[PDB]
Amino acid sequence: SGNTGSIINNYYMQQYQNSMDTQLGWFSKLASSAFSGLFGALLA
Amino acid sequence: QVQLRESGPSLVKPSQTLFLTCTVSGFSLTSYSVNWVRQTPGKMLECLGGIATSGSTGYNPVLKSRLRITKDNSKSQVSLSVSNVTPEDTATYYCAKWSSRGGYDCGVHSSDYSYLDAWGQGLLVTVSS
Amino acid sequence: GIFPVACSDGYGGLVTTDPKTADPAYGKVFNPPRNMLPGRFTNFLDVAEACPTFLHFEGDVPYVTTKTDSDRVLAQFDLSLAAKHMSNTFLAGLAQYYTQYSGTINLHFMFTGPTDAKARYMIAYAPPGMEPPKTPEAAAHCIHAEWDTGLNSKFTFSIPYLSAADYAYTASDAAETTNVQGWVCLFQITHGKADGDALVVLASAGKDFELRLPVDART
Amino acid sequence: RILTTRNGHTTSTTQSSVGVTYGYATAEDFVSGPNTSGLETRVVQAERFFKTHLFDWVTSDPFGRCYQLELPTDHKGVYGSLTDSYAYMRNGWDVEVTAVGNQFNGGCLLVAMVPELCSIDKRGLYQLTLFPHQFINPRTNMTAHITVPFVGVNRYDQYKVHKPWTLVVMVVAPLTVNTEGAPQIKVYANIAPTNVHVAGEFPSK
Amino acid sequence: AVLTQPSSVSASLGQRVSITCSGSSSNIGRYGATWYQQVPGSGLRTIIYGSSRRPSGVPDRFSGSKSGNTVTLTISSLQPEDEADYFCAAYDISTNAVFGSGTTLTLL
């Protein structure tokens, strides 16, 4: 994911390697909503 | 008859612990709680607290963290402790009995159906540097 | 040839808290059978939730004696596990070693007076925003519970853990002065002929008391 | 381009507006988390506009002029007593600022709700467009409409200790244009706490 | 001492003496205050408990009543043995009782 190479899996489990996120129940979604198209007729 | 005799030290140097006692006589401490109230020279009364028949007790909130009251249920004497006395703690110290099983806090000082009927003669505690 | 490896200049030392299982010495020893043995508790907070212990009140007793006035306040204490009132319970004694809890502390009150005398008490949790309540009328508003004494005396209460952080510390660091977890109270809203009749209190863990980040302390 | 808005029973309608600007999200995130034990209770009688006067920018007012109102300000009635009477309050903001340009004042103005703002320095204003902003030029429009959700490290925030959102309305175009227009253009703010929740009740006096 | 007391009052024998003790909404009215007596040189006795009652062992000439936020001690007859300091004391919402200054009552 991050900076790591290490094509082999971590020796230690993920739980002892890092911490685990718990679930409940944008700017890349703003950049692609970008008004690229020109407002008026391109001529020539 | 019921009477309360209080024995303690007088003339002690400030910044020192105070060991007061109220030998209780005439009745079983298990049936009537005792409260401690003091009187500064002149005319004032600053309730110190009391100990119910049961172990639980209470103290004055502004004077708490410098009061600890034990109860020898056999010798029938109740004791005070003052952590560090200042030249203003000088007062006339009394011990008093409520008519009900629990009157440990300062709440017994004003009550609808309970009073403090028996008061010790009072000791005058003097501290000065 | 031989297989090359690169011994890292770093992270070769003893962490002192690392899943490492030390290498084998004097093996093939079959310890005596210790199967089907009574009172086996896999983890802590299974014993704390199940075996409640007393709390400490003024004069070194686990009970708070009913006062004789009709409306008065009883034992009021901070909520954090380092609270002098819980200084002698199993829950606080164990949460000492951990840095942050995330659960509802559970209080049991059982009445010990004679069947002659009834009494009706209430306990009210007060968040950390404003001074604690001082009268039942001024405390009825916050989360509270009322109960009358009867054939069954034990009345539990689940002190709700609600805080602005998903976890909350178990050791009140000296920096602040009014506990950030808020006070609980216990009031004499009325009593019968019971004066100086002991109400013993208990503490426990709730259905979800989760404890994490164990740390050391001189104790 | 009429935009008629509405919150509770208070409605704000602008004859000429440019468009609502969502910031950092389109709807509130998960509400009843694991901390508050599900004792959260949504308030709906508190989602209403309130008018809050703000600075009056004149021709003498240079480029860098920033006036930031700490977000949530003193309130009267629902959402004012509430923070006093409840603990761990949460609410997303709908913010509105209206300056009457008169169409002859070309001085531009930039209004942007910033995340726990701390007195942004003169250098910081140039890259201050990163935060959700609508910069209202009076010739183009006379009102700014921004809506943002509650954003803090804490799941709920005790508004009595710190306030998470801050309006920052700075004069982006240098000075102002007063070529037979409005003498001075004073700017107000229709702020409206939307999607509010509360957790714990205080012992009342 | 954190209550209002009317200094020291006087009267002659067989005269009615009314000593008022004025407090605050938190300290008095919620709970009726109590009335003490202290003979110069001797200890405290309780004269009114519950703001309106008498302790047994105290004669009937002492009568107290509570109104609003002030209470009043009424000695229906005075005697030479009723000259002493009179303190009013009441439980405050602060969990500490607040005491009067003492209405030395001198007989003429």
Next chain:
Amino acid sequence: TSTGESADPVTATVENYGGETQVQRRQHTDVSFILDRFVKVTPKDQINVLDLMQTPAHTLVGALLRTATYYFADLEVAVKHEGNLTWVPNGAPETALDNTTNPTAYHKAPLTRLALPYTAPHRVLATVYNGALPTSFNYGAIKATRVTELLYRMKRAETYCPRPLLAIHPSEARHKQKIVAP
């Protein structure tokens, strides 16, 4: 082109007069890569807390961390020490740091790299706080007899809510810097 100031991103794309935009390769400018690098931090002799804000302001990881208000990071500290250093979790007693039960490590090598998990109480951390940040924004603390140099890493970072970044203001136009060359 020609749109109103409604705060909506508009990109010319370099083809609105002629030609076609190239397929830019975007990598190692994202929030994980650029924040996975190590960074020396001035360490308080014999005792110090791990507050990512302690990073120097004028640094790659330092500035590109201060660019975001809220950040979640697991931290890989790499300490040079002189004796056993111990790392207490986030909400832990000053006396607790000098213990062997709480994770410490023995002087084994030049530097001892620890993977310190994310142990904060709050949902996520913050780089600026309304009201110095609270004393609760921490990754525990460490304590050696001396610490010669400290190093943070922000592993698997995920940041939120961008903040203004600043470049050095040149005294003259086109401020110049001496570039490496033979």
